[PDB]
Structures are given as C-alpha cells and as structure tokens.
Design a protein around this ligand. Structure first.
Ligand SMILES: C[S@@+](CC[C@H](N)C(=O)[O-])C[C@H]1O[C@@H](n2cnc3c(N)ncnc32)[C@H](O)[C@@H]1O
Ligand SMILES: C[S@@+](CC[C@H](N)C(=O)[O-])C[C@H]1O[C@@H](n2cnc3c(N)ncnc32)[C@H](O)[C@@H]1O
Ligand SMILES: Cc1cc(=O)n2nc(-c3ccccc3)c(-c3ccccc3)c2[nH]1
Ligand SMILES: Cc1cc(=O)n2nc(-c3ccccc3)c(-c3ccccc3)c2[nH]1
Ligand SMILES: [Cl-]
Ligand SMILES: [Cl-]
Lengths: 380, 380
C-alpha cells in the first residue's frame, strides 16, 4: 500500500526564480505608489542581462534600473566571480502600456467588485493534512533545504556556496482512506553552485551534515536513504550564465510539487485582476479552509474564468474520499461561503498590498500566514 | 455523482505558443545537421521582437534570422496590420554554448545509453480511456476549436480572423469506478484576434455556427450550454503586441489540460538529454501502453531524475482504482517492459529526429501517431 512521490524546489538564485522575484519586485514597486496598477511584467535572465518585457499601466514612477539591481543584490549576485553582478549587469526594458482592448473588456468603467477576470483560464487549490501547514511534505522539505543553503551562505559558515541551487525529495508514503501519510525519505538530491576552490568531498560532507541533517528529521532518514549530492560533479558556472531564466517557469515549485493539479498560469509579475494568481490564491484559501475546518483531510478545488466575466465559469471539488460529505455538498458549502469574483478576492486577500516579492521564492503556499493561509470559518 | 472540469487551449499565434514553435524550429534546424546537438533555446516575444536566449552546443550552422522568420510566416503574422510581421520584426540572439560544467556531468565521455539526465526533475504521464486517443475530452475539444479557427483563417472563409486565439471547454462528467465519462459540454469560451472592420455579432454568429458546431458533436450541446464568444468585446490588438510571450508558459495546454499532474518542466527548445521532455514523452508512452494494453482505464505515472544520473530515482503508478492489478503489480510490469534512462528513451522514441516543431501547437499528446503515442506490447 506504499508508493513513492517526488517534489523539487529551487533557491533564490536559480535563474527562473531570479526572474519571478524581479517581476514581483516590479509589481510591488508599482503597487507602493498606485494600488490599482495593471502589471504584467515578465523577466528574462541570461549572462549579464535582465530584460523586462510586458505590459504596465500605472500612475507610479518606477526606476526599473534600481528595482532590478536591488532585487539581484538581495539574492546575492554581487560579483563577476559569482557569474552575475547587480552592479554591472545590463538591464533592458521593453514595457508598453496594457492593451486598450484588454483594458476596455476587463476593467474600464466597471465597478470594482464587478471587474471582469483579466483572462480566461483554469486554476486549482490544494490542501493536505499531512503537515500542519497543509502542504505536501515532499515540497516542504525541498524548500527548506534551499532555504538552509541560503542561510549558511549568508551567515558565512559555508562561504563557497553561491545563490543558484536545486533540491529534490522523494518520500515513501502510505495510503490512508484517501489521505496520505509520509513514512520515510527515500532519496534526496541537492545541487548548488560553488566556488572554484572547494572540493567535492568537502561539499558532499557539508551538504549531508550541515544541510540535510539540519532540515530533515532523523526519523525519516535511514540506512536505505539515497543521497545524490552535487551529482553533476562540478557546478562553478551557475545563475543565468549557466542557464537562461524566465518568469513563470517554476509553477510547480510555486504551488504543490506535483500534488493536486495546476492550470498552467504563472503568478509573478501580475496584479490581482490576473486570475492566474488571485484565483489560485483564493482556491488555496478554500482548500485550506475545508481541511482546517475539519470537512476534509485532503482536497483539490478547480475554478475557471472567461476574460471580462466576473463570476467563475466553473467550480469543482474533489475530496479523495476524505470527507463524510459528498463533493456536491462541499461545493454548496464553498458557494455559500466564498465569492470568487476577482473584485471580491482582492478585498478578502488584500491583493493590492505590495507583499508579492516575498511570495516569489520557497513557494507561495504554506508559509508566513499570508491571507490565503488564514482559514475562513465556514458556516453550514 | 457528476462534476465539472475545465481545460483550455491556444492557437498557433498565441504569443507563448509562437515562442514554443520558434524554439522547436531552432531545435529541428540544429538536429537536421547534428543529431547530437545540445539545445536549450528559449524564445521571448513582444511587439516587434523575437529574442532567442539560452545555450546551444552543436556542429550545425543555423541561420537564426531565417529560421525565426519562416516560423512566424507559417503562423500567419505577415503584415503590420495584424500586429506582427515576420518580414520586418527584430530578431535578437543571446545564445551561448552549453555550460561546460553541465556537459562534463551529463554527457562528456559517456556511453550514449548511460548518459546522465540533463537535469534533476519530476515528470508525469497520463492516459484516460474516455477518448480513443486516450486524452481528456476537455482538452481535445479545446485544441480542435483552435485548429478550426486556423483552418477557416487559412482557407479564407473567415478572413477577419488573426492567428492569436484561446479556447476553453468545461465538460460535465460522471464518475465510473475511477474512470470518467463525459456527459455534456457545460461552457465554451472562444477569444480570437480579429480585424478592425468585423462586428461582434458577425463574429459571435460565426464562432457558434462555423467553429463550435463544426467541432463539438451536437449530442454534447444543449439548451443549457453557456457560450462566452469574444467575451472581452474587442480583440484587435493581439499576438506579442497584446501580450508578451515566452517559451514554456503553456505547459498544461501542452499536456493534459489540468488532468493527471505536471512536474513543471517545459518541452520546447530542448534536445533529448533534457528529461523534462524525453521522460515526459516516455511517461505518456507508458501510460498509454497500460490503457491500450487493457491493464487500466485511467493511469498516472511519475518519474524523477538527478542531473548526471541515468536511471530514474523514482517511478510511481496510480491507477485511480481502474485496474484489477495493484499499483505495485503495475509498477513491476512497467519496470520489466520499459527502460527510462534518457539514452534508451532516445532510441525507443527516435528523439534525434527533427519533428519537434510539429509538437509545439495543439498539444504534444493524443495526435499524429508520434512514437510515444504508439503503445508498446507488454509482457507479463
Ligand atoms: C541543468 S540546467 C538546464 C539545462 C541547461 N539549460 C543546458 O544547457 O543543458 C537547469 C538548472 O540546473 C542547475 N545547474 C546549472 N548548472 C549545473 C551544474 N553544473 N550542475 C548541476 N546543476 C546545474 C541550475 O539551477 C540551472 O538553472
Ligand atoms: C489577456 S492576455 C494576459 C493579460 C495581459 N498581459 C495584460 O496586460 O492584461 C493573455 C492572452 O489573452 C489573449 N488576448 C489578448 N488580448 C485580448 C483581448 N483583447 N481579448 C481577449 N483575449 C485577449 C491573447 O491570447 C493573450 O496572449
Ligand atoms: C495509492 C494512491 C492514492 C492517492 O490518493 N493518490 N494521489 C496521487 C496523486 C494524484 C495527482 C497528483 C499527485 C499525486 C497518487 C499518485 C501516487 C504516485 C504517482 C502518481 C500519483 C496517488 N496514489
Ligand atoms: C469524483 C472525482 C473522481 C476522480 O477520479 N477525480 N479525479 C480528479 C482530478 C484529479 C487531478 C487532476 C484533475 C482531475 C477529480 C477532480 C474533479 C473536479 C475538480 C478537481 C478534481 C476527480 N473527481
Ligand atoms: Cl531548471
Ligand atoms: Cl495567456
């Protein structure tokens, strides 16, 4: 009755994640001056280059050079020896206004609560009682391994570390009436960019003793656990120099690590009218509210929209057999307790607030008591 | 016992899809000259611009200007009046060699069958008996609606159409012992870029009569079906001018439309050593082989890899309760019948062949009898 499941995460200096963080730094900079900014900011990263491309209509006056370079500085790319330097990279901007055709169909001359969805699309929310924060253990552990690397880099105890990292965790689970119960960690992968002087053995020993053991409870690690630590053997070239980055290329890291489902939309760089983000956050909030409210142990919520239409076109609930109530009954509870129009989600989840850069590494869910992580008390 | 499920698709001129097609045109151009080319080609599109960014190590001599412009011509963006013109757009190139650190850890001095995975990651394959091609009806219909638009554009019967389109289909399903049975179409969305002269009523009438009715069987359409046709009211600005495009931003359209699961990796622009593509294709092949072999009605397969390691780190099977055999037994059948090392997948699925641009619109799965769509006869 057991099975394996694998999830991955990446660090703050992973090139795709750099782009997500820059896109959300730009969004936050606009929102600080104009809470109603319309933002659709993609970031592209390659050796020596950050390019911003997309559509922004905003009353803000934003210094893109400063916003980009400060985000890169925070990540830790501050010297040519590391492969990338915020002080001296190229920042290119190809930003236009939002299409007037979109604007007129979505939000122009519309009451805020009745704004249309900014696009069509589908979105999912997921929650699992296997951890207190209602997230899959595989992805929680993967994120925490990347966060530990950044901590040990920033505090100087492993000064050979660089910002670009990836981790991957495979857990053996037991089925339990539709819920899932973690048993043990089967395999861990860690790859992290490093300086030219440190040797493989020093790195592998540190990754096991100072990273894995500082993150993963010993009860999950045993004589059979497989470790792939610096499996490529050499990772000196990294960041955008090693691999181009783009916004919205870590959408599974951003969400549930392969569990649940995904509708395809990226989060970073987008204001609340883009339901790819706001409705996914709302669907997480619904799912977590159902689990924390004791109605389910595990649940998947789908919603979908049409551009220009406020109310979702469809709402669906799948409880994996982990509720006494039928999925039909849960759907009625959701419809009674939640209003998933984007112009209402924005009020419930406070989505004009410039907190987005904080969401753009280590997953958008399961951390920090963001509004979508605070369950709603359900009436039924 | 019924539920709704929604999937979307996009057309050939959708800006993200333009990028996927260009990335795969570049891959094919390299493979035509060098079957062992190492390609990681991202494309970015905005008003007037195609940018190629990434890493290519290849013996080919490729004229990027010609390859990009011919791909855009094929899509149909051939005039400033349409918002984009292959003849006169900017093509910018920021392509470097593959990182030598990656190369040495993945493929340098390695027997081809024993090449390492080109990255870590997780990948899923899915199949459902609800259609002959073993794909979800929601996404099949969504793709076919986009293909119908392109057909009517290219044959001149709706000459106001432009290449950028999106569609979305919501189907009401019945559960059936873990399998799913489509009942009816609940809602259809179509948005398509159009010329300045055609009016909304002419467009909505054509979309219903000449597009939907030519694609969706009447048995699925009834008095309750909801139609959102040109719901934004105006879509003259389109293509990259309306919305930036990037490679790998339609990964759910490329796969299963929200059904099954996704590991996060993009397909387009990548040679066979990038398991994001090859192992997802192999996992589809496994899933479809299990369904066509009569072992399951519906199945999800996960695999995962570490950079530099040939064999998958994990393999998992979930049959939704649609097999008499346990998931454990199915996993043993898979392990006996398939070798999911990338250096073996390449031989089984013929992944050096330059057929990739054909995969880059209308989904990678369920069409055209590609090798991953031809089931393997299973021995057990
Ligand atoms: C392996 S690269 C993707 C393939 C790459 N584009 C190529 O040209 O082969 C994906 C990610 O792996 C990590 N990476 C880069 N160089 C690496 C190395 N030498 N060893 C291990 N991981 C590496 C970085 O996080 C990078 O963003
Ligand atoms: C709605 S746009 C995403 C939001 C956009 N970036 C913005 O600035 O608001 C996403 C896709 O919708 C389609 N689209 C563009 N303009 C549209 C319009 N006026 N009406 C409907 N769909 C449109 C195109 O396929 C485009 O790639
Ligand atoms: C026995 C059993 C009970 C169960 O409820 N589930 N759910 C999922 C699942 C579904 C979608 C996304 C991620 C996980 C799976 C599964 C396990 C291994 C590989 C693939 C899927 C599963 N396997
Ligand atoms: C009753 C029933 C039986 C069943 O086997 N499934 N599977 C899925 C599913 C799981 C992952 C991805 C896509 C679909 C769902 C479902 C339905 C509506 C919304 C969300 C999920 C479902 N609902
Ligand atoms: Cl990556
Ligand atoms: Cl889109």
């Amino acid at each position: 009755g057991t099975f394996l499941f694998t999830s991955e995460s990446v660090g703050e200096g992973h090139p795709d994640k750099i782009c997500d963080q820059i896109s959300d730094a730009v969004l936050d900079a606009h929102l600080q001056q104009d809470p109603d900014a319309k933002v659709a900011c993609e970031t592209v990263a390659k050796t020596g280059m950050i390019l911003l491309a997309g559509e922004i209509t905003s009353r803000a006056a934003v210094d893109y050079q400063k916003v980009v370079r400060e985000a890169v500085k925070h990540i830790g790319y501050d010297d040519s020896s590391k492969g990338f330097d915020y002080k001296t990279c190229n920042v290119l901007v190809a930003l236009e206004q939002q299409s007037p055709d979109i604007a007129q169909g979505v939000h122009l001359d519309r009451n805020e609560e009745d704004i249309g969805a900014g696009d069509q699309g589908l979105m999912f929310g997921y929650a699992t009682d296997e951890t207190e924060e209602c997230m899959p253990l595989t992805i929680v552990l993967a994120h925490k391994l990347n966060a530990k690397l950044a901590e040990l880099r920033r505090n100087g105890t492993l000064p050979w570390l660089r910002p670009d990292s990836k981790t991957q965790v495979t857990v053996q689970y037991m089925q339990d009436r539709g819920a899932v119960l973690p048993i043990r960690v089967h395999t861990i992968v860690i790859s992290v960019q490093h300086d030219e002087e440190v040797c493989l053995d020093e790195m592998r020993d540190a990754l096991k003793e100072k990273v894995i053991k500082a993150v993963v409870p010993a009860k999950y690690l045993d004589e059979d656990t497989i470790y792939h630590l610096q499996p490529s053997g050499r990772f000196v070239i990294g960041g955008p120099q090693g691999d181009a980055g783009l916004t919205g290329r870590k959408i599974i890291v951003d969400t549930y690590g392969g569990w649940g489902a995904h509708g395809g939309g990226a989060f970073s760089g987008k204001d609340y009218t883009k339901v790819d983000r706001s409705a996914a956050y709302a669907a997480r909030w619904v799912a977590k509210s159902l689990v924390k409210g004791g109605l389910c142990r595990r649940v998947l919520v789908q919603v979908s929209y049409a551009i220009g239409v406020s109310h979702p076109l469809s709402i669906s609930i799948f409880h994996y057999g982990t509720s006494q109530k039928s999925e039909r009954e849960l759907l009625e509870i959701v419809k009674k307790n939640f209003d998933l129009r984007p112009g209402v989600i924005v009020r419930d989840l406070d989505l004009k607030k410039p907190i987005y850069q904080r969401t753009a590494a280590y997953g958008h869910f399961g951390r920090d008591s963001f509004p979508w992580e605070v369950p709603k008390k359900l009436k039924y």
